[PDB]
Amino acid sequence: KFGYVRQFETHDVILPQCYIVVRIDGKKFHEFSKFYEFAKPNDENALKLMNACAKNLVLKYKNDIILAFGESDEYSFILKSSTTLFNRRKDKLATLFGSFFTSNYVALWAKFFPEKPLNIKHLPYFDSRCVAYPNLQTIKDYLSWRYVDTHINNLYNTTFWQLIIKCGLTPQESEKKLCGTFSNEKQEILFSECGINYNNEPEMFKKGSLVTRKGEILHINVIAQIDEL
Amino acid sequence: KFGYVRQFETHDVILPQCYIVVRIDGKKFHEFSKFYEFAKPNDENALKLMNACAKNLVLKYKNDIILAFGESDEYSFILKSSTTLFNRRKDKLATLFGSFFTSNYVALWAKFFPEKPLNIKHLPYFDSRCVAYPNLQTIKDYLSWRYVDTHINNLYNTTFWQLIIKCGLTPQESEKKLCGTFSNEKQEILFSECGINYNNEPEMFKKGSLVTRKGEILHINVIAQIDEL
Amino acid sequence: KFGYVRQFETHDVILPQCYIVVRIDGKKFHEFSKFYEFAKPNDENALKLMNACAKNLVLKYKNDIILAFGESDEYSFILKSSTTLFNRRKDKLATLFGSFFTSNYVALWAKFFPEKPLNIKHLPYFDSRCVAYPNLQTIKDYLSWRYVDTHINNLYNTTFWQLIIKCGLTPQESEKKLCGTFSNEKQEILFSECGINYNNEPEMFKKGSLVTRKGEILHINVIAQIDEL
Amino acid sequence: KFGYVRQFETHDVILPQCYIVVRIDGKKFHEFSKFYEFAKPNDENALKLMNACAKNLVLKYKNDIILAFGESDEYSFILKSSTTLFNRRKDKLATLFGSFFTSNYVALWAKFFPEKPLNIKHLPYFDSRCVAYPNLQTIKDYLSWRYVDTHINNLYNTTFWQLIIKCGLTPQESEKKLCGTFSNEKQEILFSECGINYNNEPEMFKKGSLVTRKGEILHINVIAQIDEL
Numbered sequence A, B, C, D: 001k002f003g004y005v006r007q008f009e010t011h012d013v014i015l016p017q018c019y020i021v022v023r024i025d026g027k028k029f030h031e032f033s034k035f036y037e038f039a040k041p042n043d044e045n046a047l048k049l050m051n052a053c054a055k056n057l058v059l060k061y062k063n064d065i066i067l068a069f070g071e072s073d074e075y076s077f078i079l080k081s082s083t084t085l086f087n088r089r090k091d092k093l094a095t096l097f098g099s100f101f102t103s104n105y106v107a108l109w110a111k112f113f114p115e116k117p118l119n120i121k122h123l124p125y126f127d128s129r130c131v132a133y134p135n136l137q138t139i140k141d142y143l144s145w146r147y148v149d150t151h152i153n154n155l156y157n158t159t160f161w162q163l164i165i166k167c168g169l170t171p172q173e174s175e176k177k178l179c180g181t182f183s184n185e186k187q188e189i190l191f192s193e194c195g196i197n198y199n200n201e202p203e204m205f206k207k208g209s210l211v212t213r214k215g216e217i218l219h220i221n222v223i224a225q226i227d228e229l
């Protein structure tokens, strides 16, 4: 009857024998972490909750997910190249993982933050993406890339917010001080002038949250994913 | 450094000057509605909640949404043929609307169901799609199609469940009984044997839930949407 | 047995109810035309060959083509927004039109250039493209855009080559010479110094080449394609 | 000015680090070879024409092709997993090989068939396609799939037409006579009843036509393509 409109849709699928990354990146989590007054560069609970949602998800698809890695508002799920999940539908993959994740976020909020509840006008909601990785080397480098990303970001943010806190700086000059440095330089700027050793930093913050199937862990890259299969 | 993995993504975008439909349809909502013991054929609270999320979602993007229409676990949001929202990106449209709606559902569950709190192991989560409609007639027809679908379904399901309830039938001979029947025939099964008149069914069940901008109403297809532009 | 590799293909199609443009443009036609000594930026024979090919093509699909417009090495074919040809498929439409065209080119060459035969090492070969246009305006404007292009460029290159030919200019100072000018300014540069009038330039050069179904004509935009339906 | 129409085009490309195949299959080659009265089901000259074309094609892009394999009206060209050609664009790869090839066919037709020239109303034109293969296994299997199809088809069609030709059979009873047979059974039907030995059938008909870079060979699968890289 009016059914012909269904003609217009698109059911496109990810290429066979490719890994699938589904990545989830929270929308405006700058302002979102501002409103609920998160813990500044790093909120132990906010990050842990992310981990919770991620764990529940890889638990949910325990067969198709090799592992996951979370950063800020972001979390990444690796789908084995052989997966038939959702008949390899991009939309279904992305949207469904995202909704499920979002749903676990909202659900589990009460546990991690009895402090400040959700109000309404300001809510979490997340982006989701399907990315095709044809061979193992690429997935490995993808995962690495995220890991880099977290490393750099925590470094910069940490030595930035210490300067404001400890040395009383404004956002402008704390930036100029940090401009053009190295990884090591900032760690010195942390160690002497901010007076804090960066290795003494908690390990979930530096090296990011990596969920294998079930129980989850935090360390660098040694690719023993090579072994897990 | 590793950044070339971003080389693998796809930013594909809805063709310019096309109306957009972002459709949301809950996953495994049969099991969902069974576990929380929804009101079978129709749960007033459930549908209303759905409506709440919708109202908040067209509120959120006021500029780009013409209107929305909800059915069961489904909602359809129309975007204006000229919209730049999220730069016309399929992924972002779909996934973001999905997260948001979902987020809204889990938030407002506390409100609509003090009866049964959420547990965990059963959580609401929804699928999302983008569709591209090159002209007004098709988008119109689309909406029509949805409405038709809700009218037909509601009639079948209603005479089905009143057969089971009132006359104590098993699903099978209720199916074969209902098999190959017609409109007036179902409604006849309804009033005589099931002792209930169909026109007195709440309007929101029969004709579905239509969200215009801000507040929302429930009737058929008469295109007064044609006038609002 | 090995047949699974077939499952790797992609069957993607043009969104329904969109006019379709198929554009053909010959690769390296600068070097090509330079090799075969085409006449300056205007060769009656080459353009007539192109037109003949296109005439053959709209002859071939008389059912799906509204009309077609040639400029240089370019030819654009407008398929009706309703067409089901090749089931609306990109690969088939681009490559098949391209092939067909290329084949007619190479066929009818001996006709249009009995002067010089084809050699081998340099052969005509053409890029083809599929574009979707969701309504009338867009299509009209596309066509416009093309006609525009042919008109403008006919003027610029004409006066350029007269500056080189008649006035003995080198390209560089002919370019700085023509730089910044206007339409009638250029026509004057043509009329006084180079001794030719641009209104008597052949209407096929100026207003571009246009083929409706069957017989073909050259003028501007008066969109009388409006009526044909 | 009208330029916005260009914003409707589509740049979609092949996923990085995938072998590409460009396959070429002439539309309606049944009627073409019927019209030009080709040789039963194997025309030596037709095949070598096809071959010279593909050689010129691999010749043209010597950098990005591992090799090419032709069968009937078909030819397949394997592009290396790392290729940047046409910036990996679907449209350009398909249409360009399509057109070059078509051009080469029509050109070198003179050489291969001095017997009957091309006419007009019946002209060769070819469908072209792109396929992405994420790994060597699959590209190998692709090729295998092809060689398989040609071997199988050559036997079936050969004893088919020998049954028609020599024993005076009509297509129906040849079709049944051949129905459900095995390889060796068919070669029998060939040796006892049609009087011909399928071992002495020309290796270019049986084992297909394989172009490595430059000069080209006909044998089976022994993948020394593994070493050439």
Ligand SMILES: Nc1nc2c(ncn2[C@@H]2O[C@H](COP(=O)(O)OP(=O)(O)OP(=O)(O)O)[C@@H](O)[C@H]2O)c(=O)[nH]1
Binding pocket: A025, A026, A027, A028, A029, A030, A031, A033, A034, A038, A039, A040, A041, A042, A043, A044, A046, A047, A071, A072, A073, A074, A127
């Ligand atoms: N305060 C605070 N913010 C966090 C924390 N974890 C993540 N975030 C926020 O999330 C951001 C991560 O980068 P983005 O995802 O690009 O920020 P975004 O603006 O929310 O996301 P987009 O709109 O997609 O660009 C940071 O700027 C933080 O503000 C945290 O533990 N504490």
Ligand SMILES: Nc1nc2c(ncn2[C@@H]2O[C@H](COP(=O)(O)OP(=O)(O)OP(=O)(O)O)[C@@H](O)[C@H]2O)c(=O)[nH]1
Binding pocket: B025, B026, B027, B028, B029, B030, B031, B033, B038, B039, B040, B041, B042, B043, B044, B046, B047, B071, B072, B073, B127
């Ligand atoms: N009992 C009850 N069920 C509802 C209500 N609203 C929606 N539903 C359920 O939602 C379903 C709608 O159909 P689908 O969305 O295709 O069901 P689904 O199995 O969850 O979805 P998929 O797994 O993606 O195919 C119905 O079968 C209903 O059971 C309600 O108000 N009451």
Ligand SMILES: Nc1nc2c(ncn2[C@@H]2O[C@H](COP(=O)(O)OP(=O)(O)OP(=O)(O)O)[C@@H](O)[C@H]2O)c(=O)[nH]1
Binding pocket: C025, C026, C027, C028, C029, C030, C031, C033, C034, C037, C038, C039, C040, C041, C042, C043, C044, C046, C047, C072, C073, C074, C127
């Ligand atoms: N000499 C001559 N050249 C022509 C004529 N018509 C078209 N051309 C050539 O066609 C070109 C038109 O632009 P393009 O199609 O972009 O040329 P191209 O660089 O060979 O094509 P691409 O590689 O696809 O960009 C001019 O540079 C001319 O060299 C003609 O009548 N005479």
Ligand SMILES: Nc1nc2c(ncn2[C@@H]2O[C@H](COP(=O)(O)OP(=O)(O)OP(=O)(O)O)[C@@H](O)[C@H]2O)c(=O)[nH]1
Binding pocket: D025, D026, D027, D028, D029, D030, D031, D033, D034, D038, D039, D040, D041, D042, D043, D044, D046, D047, D072, D073, D127
């Ligand atoms: N007689 C003859 N036919 C050949 C030869 N080589 C290829 N063919 C034709 O090639 C065809 C291969 O299949 P297709 O190309 O799919 O046939 P088609 O109907 O012409 O093409 P499509 O419309 O694309 O399906 C066979 O039907 C043959 O008729 C040959 O050497 N001799």
Ligand SMILES: [Mg+2]
Binding pocket: A025, A026, A027, A028, A029, A073
């Ligand atoms: Mg973000």
Ligand SMILES: [Mg+2]
Binding pocket: A025, A071, A072, A073, A074
């Ligand atoms: Mg981020």
Ligand SMILES: [Mg+2]
Binding pocket: B025, B026, B027, B028, B029, B073
């Ligand atoms: Mg559903």
Ligand SMILES: [Mg+2]
Binding pocket: B025, B072, B074
């Ligand atoms: Mg449904």
Ligand SMILES: [Mg+2]
Binding pocket: C025, C026, C027, C028, C029, C073
């Ligand atoms: Mg060109």
Ligand SMILES: [Mg+2]
Binding pocket: C071, C072, C074
């Ligand atoms: Mg041009």
Ligand SMILES: [Mg+2]
Binding pocket: D025, D026, D027, D028, D029, D073
């Ligand atoms: Mg064919």
Ligand SMILES: [Mg+2]
Binding pocket: D025, D072, D073, D074
């Ligand atoms: Mg074939």
